[PDB]
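Ops channel
N.P.: pipeline sanity check, posting one input/output pair.
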């Protein structure tokens, strides 16, 4: 990233909901990004389910995921959310955010390869300690909104250290809104409600293509009650609607 510039006009969307959080928005490239909070833009948080993006790429690159038509079969044993109790494609597993599919991917990738790829991707603090199947859920890995937009820009441009076909496969799995005039790729996350005096984090990260332009975005907020979870999309959506990007 080049520079990060404060835009105070976005604060109103946070204060109206009593949300402590940050939005980072970059037109064309991470050369120039805007944010409501310079300090929070670079503060690092657990990635939670946003980690499915690098994890999917690493799974493909290592051959743990064979291709985009692989079916991750459900063994019929209880999973923590009922929407995960079914056979899933890669896109299906990302869209329903099926943690156990990605835990098994991570186990098969292994610590050595996982560390190597997070270094190649400059992914956050690159700290995978805490258990190979949970470091991004409750371990020591942390990433900022700025770093998310840098990582997503590389993915958009096919510039990550991975094959172009594998980056294209994961990008297809990340489409969340299609209109004739714009296309959104994105991923949500929610670490949990945290503990006393130590809130969890909620995320929405991605990019928007409109006309011949591209906008990279990353939102996070502190959260201690799950009723507030939809704000992770509604606050940044309102900002991007106000900017004329979506809608
Ligand atoms: C990811 O953050 N997780 C898996 C699943 N994600 O759905 S979300 O992206 O809509 O928040 C549920 C929340 C969370 C988890 N419990 O691990
Ligand atoms: Na939501």
């Amino acid at each position: 990233m080049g520079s990060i510039t404060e835009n105070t006009s976005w604060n109103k969307e946070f204060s109206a909901e009593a949300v402590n959080g940050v939005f980072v928005l970059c037109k064309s490239s991470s050369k120039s990004c805007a944010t409501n909070d310079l300090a929070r833009a670079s503060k690092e948080y657990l990635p939670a389910s946003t980690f499915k993006i690098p994890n999917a790429i690493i799974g493909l690159e290592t051959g743990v995921i064979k291709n985009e038509h692989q079916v991750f079969k459900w063994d019929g044993k209880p999973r923590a959310m009922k929407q995960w109790e079914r056979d899933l494609t890669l896109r299906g597993a990302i869209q329903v955010s099926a943690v156990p599919v990605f835990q098994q991917i991570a186990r098969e990738v292994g610590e050595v390869r996982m560390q190597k790829y997070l270094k190649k991707f400059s992914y956050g603090n690159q700290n995978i300690s805490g258990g190979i199947d949970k470091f991004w859920l409750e371990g020591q890995l942390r990433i900022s909104a700025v770093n998310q937009v840098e990582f997503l820009e590389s993915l958009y441009l096919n510039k990550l250290s991975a094959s172009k076909e594998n980056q294209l496969i994961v990008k297809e799995a990340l489409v969340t809104e299609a209109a004739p005039e714009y296309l959104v790729h994105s991923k949500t996350g929610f670490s949990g409600v945290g503990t006393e005096s130590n809130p969890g984090v909620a995320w929405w990260v991605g990019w928007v293509e409109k006309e011949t332009e591209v906008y990279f975005f990353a939102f996070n907020m502190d959260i201690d009650n799950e009723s507030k979870l939809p704000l992770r999309k509604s606050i940044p959506t309102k900002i991007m609607e106000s900017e004329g990007i979506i809608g």
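N.P.: looks fine end to end. DSSP finds nine helices and eleven strands in the chain.
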